[PDB]
Design a protein around this nucleic acid. Structure first.
Ligand SMILES: Nc1ncnc2c1ncn2[C@@H]1O[C@H](COP(=O)(O)OP(=O)(O)OP(=O)(O)O)[C@@H](O)[C@H]1O
Ligand SMILES: N[C@H](CO)CCC(=O)O
Ligand SMILES: [Mg+2]
Length: 468
RNA sequence: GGCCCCAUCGUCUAGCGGUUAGGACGCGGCCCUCUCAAGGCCGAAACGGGGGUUCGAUUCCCCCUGGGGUCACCA
């Protein structure tokens, strides 16, 4: 069967690049009735950010992906956190030593720096230390690393399923450190060992790892294991076309959630980075993505992540994909954050309904409809001007309003239409100042539904303060 | 700089020798309308350059140009 994985490093906030790669691994595993694994790559204590792991796992679930094996769902090839697998890499590093595929190197970081300066890159000098001497120095406890002993001279073929074959000259492949002096493996060692042990057959990862692939092909050969298929996805980009970064773009999934973007919309947008539907359709479900997925429709250019298009898509989900009730539920946390309360479920549902076509993120709802939930709302200068100019007309209308018994959208419209007629004025000339009086803004939903919504008492109550 | 990957409107893309090069965001106009949106309609907007292959290149090959990625006891 097919086995894919996402192997996040817990060294910062959940990254949109992780969600993107994760999404394609999830689709390829499901499209093939295979398994999608999550493996936490915490091998660098220096960059480890406590709490990052749970945050990335929760962000993956928030986006709607599910995995079959991982740190919090079990699996037969655990543990799924590399920090708990240390003895294993040790053993494999030592096996490479015995097979003549690796060597112990005792240089200090400062000497490596100097070598890098003189010859640019490590020159493999430790390959000349007699094997027995190396073993003795290790036994005495001398700090050292274990490096991959690249076969030189030589050539290494790497096959990427999307780009074809690339033949590297071994002189281009360094004798990379496999096991660090603190006993931790580097990414190269652990990735091959764990992909093998966990049975991965399809490695789908970002293009930034393409060049490291020949090192991996060599390790699979060194261990006598069959290499999996490799697919390198194009990197998401900032507007300037450089790989997406925290300074030129928003890369934190927590920022998107906090800003009121729907996980379904963000996920749908990410699918469009490099993939397209046969019929050109842009709005589709995760399940539809899985079913239509094919590497034949994956484009290789580096996609610029367009926040404006994400917002349009989010608005599209709010208006056409989710139900009125789902939107009302998702808007609650943002109302709470804004310090606003809603009278009842019916009130909230109706307010959300009136505003649906007017907000593209959940965060915008409390902002643009603030006047629907509190008396503490802003009155724009332009609305203040429309109000003053219409005060006399509103004064004359007020009594006809306090007299209206049936407070319905159809009733109110008739009363207002009539009033504008009898006053020989355009409906707008009475609606705009009234809107300003009820909302403190000149940009809102329809006057009748806004007038109706609050109910007689509340409506007039606010209209009165405006005529004060 | 070495090595590697990539190349259609400003952005995401369709296209797999012959098309008026299509769609989406954004932008402009019009309709709708009590405002603002939403929605509908219309419009401006692309094949980076040079050689070939070929009856015929946006599609196939080569070069150049451009952009990107990568060269850590980071991943
Ligand atoms: N900017 C990016 N654009 C697209 N894909 C990315 C990006 N950054 C990482 N990825 C891919 O997404 C997954 C995320 O891995 P991870 O959580 O460790 O993020 P990372 O940015 O690579 O962190 P680290 O700095 O430790 O390397 C990997 O499969 C990686 O190839
Ligand atoms: N930990 C790496 C991501 O930062 C794994 C990349 C891969 O080999 O898939
Ligand atoms: Mg055109």
């Amino acid at each position: 069967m097919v086995v894919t994985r996402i192997a996040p490093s817990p060294t910062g906030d959940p990254h949109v690049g992780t969600a993107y790669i994760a999404l394609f691994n999830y689709a390829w595993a499901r499209r093939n009735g295979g398994r999608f694994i999550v493996r936490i790559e915490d091998t660098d204590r220096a960059r480890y950010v406590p709490g990052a792991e749970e945050r990335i796992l929760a962000a993956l679930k928030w986006l709607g992906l599910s995995y079959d094996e991982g740190p919090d769902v079990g699996g037969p090839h655990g543990p799924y956190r590399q920090s708990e697998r240390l003895p294993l890499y040790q053993k494999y590093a030592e096996e490479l030593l015995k097979r003549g595929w690796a060597y112990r190197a005792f240089e200090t970081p400062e000497e490596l720096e100097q070598i890098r300066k003189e010859k640019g890159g490590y020159d493999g000098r430790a390959r000349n230390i007699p094997p027995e001497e190396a073993e003795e120095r290790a036994r005495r406890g001398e700090p050292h690393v274990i490096r991959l002993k690249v076969p030189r001279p030589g050539t290494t073929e790497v096959k990427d399923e999307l780009r074809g074959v690339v033949v590297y000259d071994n002189q281009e492949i360094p004798d990379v450190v496999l096991l660090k002096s603190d006993g931790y493996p580097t990414y190269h060692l652990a990735n091959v060992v764990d992909d093998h042990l966990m049975g991965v057959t399809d490695v789908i990862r970002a293009e930034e790892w393409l060049v490291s692939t020949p090192i991996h092909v060599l390790l699979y050969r060194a261990f006598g294991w069959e290499a999996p298929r490799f697919y390198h996805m194009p990197l998401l980009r900032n507007p300037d076309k450089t790989k997406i970064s925290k300074r030129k773009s928003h890369t934190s999934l927590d920022w998107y959630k906090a800003e009121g973007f729907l996980p379904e919309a963000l996920r749908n947008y990410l699918c469009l980075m490099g993939f397209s539907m046969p019929d050109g359709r842009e709005i589709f479900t995760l399940e539809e993505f899985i079913q239509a997925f094919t590497w034949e429709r994956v484009s290789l250019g580096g996609p610029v992540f367009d926040l404006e298009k994400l917002r349009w898509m989010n608005g599209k989900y709010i208006r056409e994909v989710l139900s009125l009730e789902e939107v009302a539920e998702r808007v609650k946390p943002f109302l709470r954050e804004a310090g606003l309360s809603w009278e009842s479920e019916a009130y909230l549902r109706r307010a959300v309904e009136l505003m649906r076509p007017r907000f593209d993120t959940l965060k915008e709802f409390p902002e643009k409809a603030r006047y629907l939930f509190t008396e503490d709302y802003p009155v724009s200068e332009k609305a203040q001007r429309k109000l003053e100019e219409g005060l006399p007309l509103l004064k004359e209308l007020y009594p006809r309003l306090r007299a209206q018994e049936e407070w319905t959208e159809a009733a109110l419209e008739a009363l207002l239409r009539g009033f504008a007629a009898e006053k020989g004025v355009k409906l707008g000339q009475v609606a705009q100042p009234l809107r300003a009086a009820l909302t403190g803004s000149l940009e809102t939903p329809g006057l009748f539904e806004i007038l109706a919504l609050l109910g007689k008492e509340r409506a007039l109550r606010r209209l009165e303060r405006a005529l004060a």
